[PDB]
């Protein structure tokens, strides 16, 4: 099993690129990050900032999580991100995604010691 922190990094971190490289980015990344294995994960966001910058968000703006939880944090600054979403013609195991690039505040839930992101809540 995965730690919550490592799962966040696998699902959401892509510091190797400043932004999605092509319209095929999501198709490639959802596969290689093992998010089409048992099912097509329907929605997933990748962040193109350093891990340090993303972890730092846990010391930024404390806000409520969508589910009412109080351990969510919004980045003070906007970050380069990619939203990946299943589109029509997507049927497991043939997963197909729409790639949408953006520059937005991210909102994450944080836990543990060290206090690090464990769930991607939303972008604004």
- The reply to whether 67 sits in an annotated binding site is no
31 is in an annotated binding site: no
Q: Across-strand partners of 91?
A: 94
Exactly one of 48, 106, 119, 123 is catalytic; name it. Answer: 119
Burial (CB < 10 A; 0-12, 13-18, 19+), residue 80, is: middle
Quick check: is 12 catalytic? yes
Nearest alpha carbon to residue 90 among 21, 53, 44, 22: 44
Q: Judge if the upstream peptide bond of residue 69 is cis by omega within 30 degrees of 0.
A: no
Catalytic residue among 8, 9, 11, 12: 12
Residue 105 annotated as catalytic? no
73 closest CA partner among 43, 117, 114 = 117
Residues whose CB falls within 8 Å of the CB of residue 73, separated by 6 or more in sequence, listed in order: 57, 58, 59, 60, 61, 62, 63, 107, 108, 109, 110
Elucidation technique: X-ray
* Residue 41, annotated as binding a ligand: yes
Domains of the chain plus CATH, in order, are 1-124 (3.10.130.10)
The Cβ-side half-sphere exposure at 102, using a 13 Å CA radius, reads: 15
Which tokens hold the place of 102? 């953006």
Q: What is the resolution of this structure in A?
A: 2.0
User: In the β-sheet with 61-63, what is the strand arrangement from edge to edge?
Assistant: 61-63, 72-74, 106-111, 116-123
DSSP conformational letter for 59: G
7 is in an annotated binding site: yes
Closest CA to 104 of 19, 10, 2, 5: 19
């Amino acid at each position: 099993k995965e730690t919550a922190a490592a799962k966040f990094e696998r699902q959401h971190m892509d510091s190797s690129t400043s932004a999605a490289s092509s319209s095929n980015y999501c198709n490639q990344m959802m596969k290689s990050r093992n998010l089409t294995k048992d099912r097509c994960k329907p929605v997933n966001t990748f962040v193109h900032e350093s891990l340090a910058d993303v972890q730092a968000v846990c010391s930024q703006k404390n806000v409520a999580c969508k589910n009412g939880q109080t351990n969510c944090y919004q980045s003070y600054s906007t970050m380069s991100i990619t939203d990946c979403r299943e589109t029509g013609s997507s049927k497991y195991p043939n997963c197909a995604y729409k790639t949408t690039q953006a520059n937005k505040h991210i909102i994450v839930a944080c836990e543990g010691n060290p206090y690090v992101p464990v769930h991607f809540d939303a972008s604004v």
